């Protein structure tokens, strides 16, 4: 038995403003500043790459979810109380940008797929988080907006890329040129979110969707994600990586089992973790 | 100004490129195409102008294709045809690359050159009853690279092939559905809708608006997250006069009054 | 009973899948034949458009043929050759000089989707079913097939399709942009023929040049690319335009001759 520690350590671990819950085959990145409607702070951004790494290193985890817990919001934009710190100097502002880019890139490049489950406010950094995920499900009543234009800022290259790829140039320009807040219904219509469900059911829907993906070959799921990311970043049909990834399709432990299951006339029981 | 087949109206914070050949339903002529880069430049140089609109005025059409009366002249020789192509490309590229955003407000016929004009704009709103078509295939021509690129980016390969392979005329409803236009509004209200939409964009940071357009164009022409120009554009976000004000306004809990022009 | 064939009925050529007893499940010999059929259609001057459909099997293509699984995947080398063979077939369809329209009824799964996405245009009947299932076997969808899917439906929808391997309806396929037209059940072939008729009526020089321009732009051409510029300029110096220009001056219908 590992040492049970102290109340202060326990309280510190619960009050972390973002955390990773493990419930195999899921890991859940839970935004956990409910008293500020999950407005994104420095320490939240700083923690994300570590949480993503933890989920990816745990073999019981197949899929990662990202959601707002019981805050009643996904993320209500940036925390205005930190504005004075993050923008005090050019250096602090630059570091803020890097910290955010690292968090978003870590989510985007996660070996394991990431599903965002969105209720209530999903604004600014919230949209950026959501778009870094592979898949997005939102409850009715959720609200979306990207607002650097209301501040005199510009949305970064990565965030803009991810948005463009989902909604196209016209819709991206509308969103960013106006900074307007729009409904889940419009988000669905624009292609910003992939599924629209009944209010308060996004998390359950994400879990069931994740369950479906978890049931198939995880070798395939992860390879698929690499293939897609590869193609988005310039791979062609001739690219050696793309060819070898395809050929590894026939040489991996899941296909070995899939092939055996087809011959034995039984369900496949995939083992790749 | 009212005899001019195309003109620029200034009504701060808007500039409006108004097509004005109502007797040919704004069919595009050499002198219209030739004037466009100058009108765009004028709008971009005027600090009172934040947004540019393109529309068909009171002709009842956005643009009813090419002017048939000039066909003979433009295509008489290989040289004339080449010059026509260059002139049109210059007009469309000028619109596309406008530092300030451009919104097309479309009523009635939007055919051929009309679609090209519309796709060069950043944003498109059309009234119901507007009609769309791209018809070089009906003549033995090919739609240029730039025009094709812009169409592809909006509607995707399948839809682009449908449009160009058939040369068919389709409704505003279908155009909306395909992603060719961004907004579909009640017939006769496209201009008003474009003005209000432009109003919304005008109210925010114009530093941001213009930077956003550069970032997007950059990403479309090969920029990555690592590209130096993309990084410096982002960092200039924290160093510009609008952000200084935006930051203050967020802390004071008042509307931002942005000054960058 | 050839398992795949080319029917000529000017101005159409039709690539007809014809293994009804397996609901047109795709085999080695089907894949191997495709580049030749495409070449035949393209070389025949009476042919303007190519259709691809499942004939009277009641299905477009019901995935891969399970009976050849053992052979194709017996070794790394066989599997690699399979991949090359399939890629050649799909690339031949995609790069066809003449446009290709897929007419889809019933099952369109796996290789079926790959075939459909290689075509330029897709029309499906209601009741058609779609799915891409390499994930259910431990395989990965190839680069070319994935590219073509992405370009039509976007990253989110592509991930949904491939991560789940789920079977979805023609209605959802239409909604996702996977197919271009959705028609009444059992009418996809007739709809494809009429659509092909419309395209056949205009300049085939333009149709083919348009396709090259688009493919060019997708594979890295810019407005400055020499091939893009010369393709545009050839628009004014081909036999169809020469006729189109004459017809305009004479005030008569154009009768295009390029084939």
Automatic annotation (TrEMBL), chain A:
Task: Give the record's GO biological process terms.
Answer: fatty acid beta-oxidation
Q: Which CDD domains match?
A: crotonase-like
Annotated GO molecular function terms are: isomerase activity; lyase activity
List the protein's name: Enoyl-CoA hydratase/isomerase family protein
Q: Which InterPro entries match?
A: ClpP/crotonase-like_dom_sf, Enoyl-CoA_hyd/isom_CS, Enoyl-CoA_hydra/iso, Enoyl-CoA_hydra_C
Which superkingdom? Bacteria
Question: Which keywords does UniProt give here?
Answer: Isomerase, Lyase
Which family does the record claim for this protein? Answer: Belongs to the enoyl-CoA hydratase/isomerase family.
PROSITE patterns referenced in this protein's UniProt entry, alphabetically: ENOYL_COA_HYDRATASE
Q: What is the lineage of its organism?
A: Bacteria, Pseudomonadati, Pseudomonadota, Alphaproteobacteria, Hyphomonadales
PANTHER family on file: ENOYL-COA HYDRATASE, MITOCHONDRIAL (PTHR11941:SF54), ENOYL-COA HYDRATASE-RELATED (PTHR11941)
